[PDB]
Amino acid sequence: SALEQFVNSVRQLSAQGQMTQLCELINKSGELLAKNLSHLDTVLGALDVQEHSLGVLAVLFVKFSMPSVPDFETLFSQVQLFISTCNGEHIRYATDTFAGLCHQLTNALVERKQPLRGIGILKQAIDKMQMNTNQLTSIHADLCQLCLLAKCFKPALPYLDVDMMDICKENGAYDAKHFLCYYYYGGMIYTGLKNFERALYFYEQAITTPAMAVSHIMLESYKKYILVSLILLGKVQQLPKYTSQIVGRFIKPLSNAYHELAQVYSTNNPSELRNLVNKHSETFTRDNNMGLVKQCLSSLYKKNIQRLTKTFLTLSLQDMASRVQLSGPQEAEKYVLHMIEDGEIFASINQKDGMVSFHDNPEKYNNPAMLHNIDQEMLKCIELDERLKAMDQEITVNPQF
Amino acid sequence: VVIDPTRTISAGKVNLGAFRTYPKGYKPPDEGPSEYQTIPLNKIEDFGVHCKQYYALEVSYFKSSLDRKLLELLWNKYWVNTLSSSSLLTNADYTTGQVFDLSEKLEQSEAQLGRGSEDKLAKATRDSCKTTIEAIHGLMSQVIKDKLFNQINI
Amino acid sequence: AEHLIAQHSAIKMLHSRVKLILEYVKASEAGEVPFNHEILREAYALCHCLPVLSTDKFKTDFYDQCNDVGLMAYLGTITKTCNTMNQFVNKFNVLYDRQ
Amino acid sequence: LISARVDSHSKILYARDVDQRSTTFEKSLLMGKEFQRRAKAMMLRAAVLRNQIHVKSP
Amino acid sequence: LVQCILDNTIHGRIDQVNQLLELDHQKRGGARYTALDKWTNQLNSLNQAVVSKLA
Amino acid sequence: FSFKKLLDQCENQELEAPGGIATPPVYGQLLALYLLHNDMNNARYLWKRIPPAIKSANSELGGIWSVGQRIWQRDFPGIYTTINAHQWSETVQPIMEALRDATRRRAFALVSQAYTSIIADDFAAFVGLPVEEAVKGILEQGWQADSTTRMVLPRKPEQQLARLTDYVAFLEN
Amino acid sequence: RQDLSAIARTLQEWCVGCEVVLSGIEEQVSRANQHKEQQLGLKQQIESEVAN
């Protein structure tokens, strides 16, 4: 009886002025909603399926049961048909139930099994929620989580590569754990693709978050921050002074093994780091980051071979095997060849004499290459300045304090 | 009359001013736009102390009918000298001297932000802008020369 | 706009000289206008003077100049963006923050 | 204070001369990169302080 | 030559392997790169101090 | 050139067609194409995404990953041996030959940079071709070959105004 | 006499070269104004919002 009236009230606000009453209509909905909504969805796509379908589907996922019997696939396809060509215009005001729907779809696909296609659909929703230069919506985290479970980081990069400004709230629709999850999962995505620069950046931004209580997302991001900083840089990168107090008070002594790992890394001894990795091996496997610590061991070996360029020019392979602690000139030749190929060292191999010749001269800065490099870097700084001009203008328009 | 020969060359525009002083005790009236110039840190104190004790005259130039004729006829050959200027290295030491100053200015503008004269960073930004703009203009003439005489082939 | 006007006039003068010499060449080759061994010979000698400086030392020096001005321009733009960042944070600490 | 490289094959100690231009370019380029990362970091810091995003105690 | 270079009377160095004196001569426009170097250092410290303001 | 277009098309088919799990020949193409671009981070995470059902039903896919293990370990002779081991015409075979050629160019470009003097047998194993073929090719190219010691000595190998106007327009305003 | 055309073939190749450079300046100068005025205009809008 009542469900037959609300649809007629949706068409009344269509192509007219305000839709805040429609937001109140989704806010109330019907409380104890019946199955009839599915039948009401048969004749609902009059203009563009409207915001009514969002309330219907949000309630369908709010059920805590079913959600649409073992034929839930149909509901999934309906949700697809709601995101793909249906989209909407006043999603900006209905962001709360939209992000809630995406969170519930994500949680349902996580609780089920394989969330591969869920990524492909989610990226459309994100594309219609954000403005132009992209906003940090909550769904951005979900996407990452999905592509972190369904091991396919390739299509999730364009939303991660952009350093987006302003977090999208609108009628609440945002929680701190979604921010923390986006930067932590995103950090893990860049770590899996061996892009340790943006990975370290993402973990750093996950730690900097203001906090009164300690969360496990912050702990794990801090541990992985130390690991990636040991891989990318020779030592642990200093976190900013604006980082939360709970990090230095609670998170630091909890992840004691990682600071112990950095303490043994600083001595430049590989056998002692091996002993320490075997010592706390259970703790590193408990955090599920065993593998990155092995990369830390290999990066320590590479750091020890990179320290030889500063002092030697022409060095024997046996001498290198004795100093870096590799056992045999064969492993030294392997390591040097890998390091030349990956662009980590600037050296050459002489097999006849059994020698390694370090060059150390990538550029003299007369190429056009540098011209193009500097042109691109300058364009990045110009972009940054224009963004700052826009922010400053926006603030000048606003009232005084 | 005061002339800056070095800035004339670097800016490609004549840098000249004509000035007259006010008598001791006499105050200038309300209007004083004051066209901005970058003053190095070793001169800025004295500049600021005496800048209101004089005023700038409106400068203009003239030549004779014969000068007019001769300069047009001179140009018919003197154009070659404009496409062979090499301004970037003639007075290079100036731009490197200005950058030094700019660096020390930026040190002072950093000290201003440290804890706690009217916005030193904006001044330093206009100085760095002017120096860079002159440098890029030099490169513009060099690239123009490269486009005209080098990129021709057989 | 006011810095490249003297170059634009100089190039226009050069372009006129180049066009007059080119038209003399075509007039001589087409016929009617009197043929001259000496003048077209000098025009041949002028054609062989192009390109001026194609050596690798000059290329290294030209790109050295260009990278120097390029790096200087990058540091200048950094200074300006540092100033714009300073303005923004100074205003943000007043409106969105209570100092 | 020794600024040299050891050639252990021929047992000769060669004095190392620093290339002025490359060093100036290198540290300037790296400074620009560090400046850009600090700018991105403070951009996001401005965003979280604007939207008041923080971890609650309970 | 060792005593003389140590007292800065002779500007150069000794190549003991090839048995020669490599005299100090290579001078170019090194004044610019030092100015650009100090400009870089001061811009580093400044941008750090500007970002320090917000939190 | 055209392989990248097929990669993007397969990357679209990866998510558009399923139902959760994609088509096995597309999985094979995607894996071999992920090996072609040397993106082993994409290939390793693709192989672990494959369900055990297709891993048991299609053994040819495991035969494609057996090459990737050698690419991950950087064992060149093993790469050239694993390429010439399986046949899957029209689908995987036409791109495996492109992988073989790309691995040959990669190895040649590595030896030309990383080595001054290298043993001829080691170099032959690095490029996959036999010793005589390799030494013939490098002597024709211009590398210094030495017999007796069997050493090969390798030889190491507006547009502008508009940008400037934009830079001055930035600084001047 | 027969290969004389080649001289012109390079002379024209220089002429066209000049004709590009010239036009380039004409455009760049125009752009340098096109930015300036625009920016001034934009500033005059910002300065008009100070009254509100």
In order of A115, A225, A257, B84, G28, the CA distances from A293 in angstroms are 29, 12, 11, 62, 55
CA distance linking residue A321 with residue A327, whole number of Å:
5
Please name which of A7, A63, A76 lies closest in space to residue A40, comparing C-alpha atoms: A7
Residue that has been written with the tokens 């634009």 in this structure: C8
Helix (H, G, I), strand (E, B) or coil at F6: helix
**Which residue in C4, C11, C22 is closest to G8 by CB distance?**
C22
- Is residue C82 classed exposed, middle or buried when 0-12, 13-18 and 19+ CB atoms within 10 A define those classes? buried
Whether residues A190 and A216 share a domain: the answer is: yes
For an interface test with C, give the residue of G14, G26, G28, G30 to mutate (most C CBs within 10 A): G14
Distance of CA A177 to the CA centre of its chain: 13
User: Which residues in chain G have their CB less than 8 angstroms from residue C26's CB?
Assistant: 8
Q: Which two tokens stand for residue A132?
A: 């132009």
Contacts of C5 (CB under 8 A, 6+ apart): G29
Distance CA A102, CA A175 (A): 14
User: Encoding tokens for residue G22?
Assistant: 């010239």
**Nearest alpha carbon to residue F24 among F92, F99, F86:** F92
Q: For A360, left (φ over 0), alpha (ψ -120 to 50), or beta?
A: left
Phi, psi of A75 (to 5 degrees): -55, -45
Classify residue C49 as exposed, middle or buried by CB count within 10 Å of its CB (0-12, 13-18, 19+).
Answer: exposed
Q: Do B136 and F164 touch (CB under 8 A)?
A: yes
Burial A370-390 (b: 16+ CB within 10 A, else e): bbebbbebbebbbebbebbee
- From B76's Cα to the closest Cα of chain G, the distance in A is 18
CB C75 within 8 A of CB D29: no
d(CA A180, CA B65): 79
Reading the block at residue B21, the tokens are 């002083």
DSSP state, residue A15: T
Residue with tokens 């805590």: A64
Judge: B83–C2 Cβ closer than 8 Å, yes or no. no
User: Which residue from E minimizes the CA distance to B97?
Assistant: E35
From G20's Cα to the closest Cα of chain A, the distance in A is 22
- The answer on A44 and A58 residing in a single domain is no
Q: Is residue A200 located within the same domain as residue A233?
A: yes
Q: Which residues, in sequence order, are CB contacts of E7 under 8 Å at separation 6+?
A: none
Distance from CA of B97 to the nearest CA of E (A): 8
Which among A46, A58, A54 has a CA at the least distance from the CA of A11? A46
> How remote is the C-alpha of A204 from its chain's centroid?
12
Helix (H) / strand (E) containing A358: strand A355-358
Q: Residue F135 region, left (φ>0) first, then alpha (ψ -120 to 50), else beta? A: alpha
Which residues, including other chains, have CB under 8 Å from residue A157's CB and lie 6 or more apart?
A: A189, A193
Written as one letter, the residue type at D30 is: L
Cα torsion for B46, B52, B53, B58, to the nearest 10°? 110
Domain finish residue from A118, A153, A174: A174
- B105, closest residue in chain E (CA to CA): E42
Tokens of A174: 């945002």
Kindly provide the b/e burial profile for residues A125-150, where b requires at least 16 CB atoms within 10 angstroms of the residue's own CB: bbeebbeeebbbbbbbbbbbbbbbbb
Instruction: List chain B residues with CB under 8 Å of F160.
Output: 143
Domain boundary among A343, A362, A381: A362
Does some domain include residue A155?
Answer: yes
As to burial, measured by CB atoms within 10 angstroms (0-12 exposed, 13-18 middle, 19+ buried), residue E11 is exposed
Q: List, as one string, the DSSP characters of chain G.
A: --THHHHHHHHHHHHHHHHHHHHHHHHHHHHHHHHHHHHHHHHHHHTTSS--
Produce one character per residue of A199-229: b if its CB has 16 or more CB atoms within 10 Å, e if not. Answer: bbbbbbbbbbbbbeebbebbbbbbbbbbbbb
> Chain D residue closest to E53 (CA)?
D42
Distance CA E36, CA D22 (A): 12
Distances (CA, A) of A127 to A79, A150, A155, A187: 16, 21, 13, 21
Residue F72 in any domain: the answer is yes
**Residue E43 Cα, gap to closest chain D Cα (Å):** 8
Tell me, yes or no, whether F14 lies in a domain. Answer: yes
Helix, strand and coil content of chain A, in percent to the nearest 5, comes to: 60, 5, 35
Phi, psi of D26 (to 5 degrees): -60, -50
CA distance B95 to B10: 8
Could you tell me the two tokens for A367? 């190429």
Sheet hosting strand F151-153, strand order edge to edge? D12-15, D4-7, A312-316, A355-358, A347-350, F115-119, F151-153, F144-146
- In B, minimum Cα distance to E47 occurs at B110
Cα torsion A211, A216, A219, A222: sign? negative
Chain F nearest-CA residue for G43? F173
Q: Are F79 and F126 within one domain? A: no
The candidate with the shortest Cα–Cα distance to A217, out of A230, A227, A228, A203, is A203
Q: If DSSP codes are grouped into helix, strand and coil, which group holds residue F146?
A: strand
- The residue of chain C with its CA nearest to that of G28 is C1
Q: Which of F41, F46, F71, F148 to mutate to test the interface with A (most CBs of A within 10 A)?
A: F41
* Helix axes A196-207 and A216-232, enclosed angle (nearest 10): 150
The label of the residue with tokens 């630091």 reads: A252
Experimental structure resolution, Å:
3.8
Question: Tokens 């519930």 belong to which residue?
Answer: A104
Which residues, including other chains, have CB under 8 Å from residue B99's CB and lie 6 or more apart? Answer: B131, C72, E32, E35, E36, E39
Q: Where are the beta strands (DSSP E) in E1-55?
A: 12-15, 20-23
**Same-domain pairing of A236 and A291:** yes
**Cα distance between residue A287 and residue F67, in whole Å:** 32
- Strand, helix or coil at D12? strand
CA torsion through residues F24, F26, F27, F33, sign:
positive
Collect all residues with Cβ–Cβ distance below 8 Å to F42 and sequence separation of at least 6.
A153, A154, A193, F34
User: Residue F5: which H helix or E strand, with range?
Assistant: helix F2-16
Structure tokens at A168: 């999208």
Q: Smallest Cα–Cα separation from A311: which of D7, B69, F165, G36?
A: D7
**Can you tell me the distance from the alpha carbon of B117 to that of F148, in angstroms, rounded to the nearest whole number?**
79
Number of separate domains in chain F: 2
**CA quadruple B2, B5, B10, B15: dihedral, nearest 10:** 30
Q: F68 to each of A194, A201, E51, F109, how far by Cα in Å? A: 17, 30, 46, 20
Instruction: Name the residue facing D50 among C74, C81, C96 (closest C-beta).
Output: C96
End-to-end CA distance of chain D: 57
Asked whether the beta carbons of A126 and A99 are under 8 A apart, the reply is: no
Q: Is A354 left (phi over 0), alpha (psi -120 to 50) or beta?
A: left
Strand partners, E15: E20
How far apart are the C-alpha atoms of B55 and G1, rounded to whole Å? Answer: 70
> Which of E35, E49, E50 has its CB closest to that of B99?
E35
What domain range is F27 assigned to?
1-115
Q: Is F170 domain-assigned? A: no
Question: For residues F48, F49, F54 and F55, what is the CA-based torsion angle, rounded to 10 degrees?
Answer: 0
Q: What sign for the dihedral angle of Cα A274, A279, A282, A287?
A: negative
Q: How many helices (H) and strands (E) does chain D have?
A: 1, 2
Q: Do chains D and B touch (3 or more CB pairs under 8 A)?
A: no
Q: Rounded CA gap, B114 and B42, in Å?
A: 22
CA–CA min distance C55, chain G (Å): 20
Q: Which DSSP helix (H) or strand (E) runs through A308?
A: none
Full domain range(s) for residue A289: 175-307
Claim to verify: residue A281 and residue A293 sit in the same structural domain: yes
Q: How far apart are CA A343 and CA A356, in angstroms?
A: 16
Q: Token pair of A245, please?
A: 């107090």
Distance from the first to the final alpha carbon of chain F: 43
Question: CA-to-CA distance for A358 and B29, rounded, in angstroms?
Answer: 72
Contact C18 G11 (CB under 8 A): yes
**Lookup: tokens for A49:** 């399926």
Q: Nearest to residue B29, comparing CAs of B56, B52, B58, B48?
A: B52
Q: Is E36 on the interface with D (CB under 8 A)?
A: yes
Domain boundary at F115, F133, F167, which?
A: F115
Q: How far is F170 from chain C (nearest CA, A)?
A: 8
* Tokens 């590479």 -> residue: A302
- Determine whether the interchain pair D46/E43 forms a contact, defined as Cβ–Cβ distance below 8 Å: no
Is the Cα torsion angle C8, C9, C14, C17 positive or negative in sign?
A: positive
**At B79, is the secondary structure helix, strand, or coil?**
helix
Residues composing chain B? 154
* Closest C-alpha to F151, from F113, F111, F118: F118
Q: Is A183 exposed, middle or buried (0-12, 13-18, 19+ CB in 10 A)?
A: buried
3-state secondary structure of A214: coil
From residue A115, how far is each of A145, A250, C67 by CA, in Å?
A: 9, 35, 50
Tokens of B139: 């490169």
F69 and F38 in a common domain:
yes
Checking B63-66 for CB contacts under 8 A at 24+ apart, the result is none
Within this chain, do residues A26 and A101 fall inside the same structural domain, yes or no?
no
In 3D space, the residue among F35, F37, F41 whose CA is nearest the CA of residue A199 turns out to be F41
Place of tokens 């290298």: F118
Whole-angstrom distance, CA of residue A82 vs CA of residue A55: 12
Portion 94-153 of A in contact with F at CB < 8 A? 113-114, 116-117, 119-120, 150-153
Element (H, E) at C36: none
Q: What is the domain count for chain A?
A: 4
Give the distance from CA G31 to its chain's centroid. Answer: 7
Same domain (yes/no): F37, F94: yes
Does residue F39 sit in the same domain as residue F80? yes
B/C interface, count of CB pairs below 8 Å = 79
- Please state, in angstroms and rounded to a whole number, the distance separating the CA atoms of residues A62 and A56: 10
Q: Do C3 and B12 touch (CB under 8 A)?
A: yes
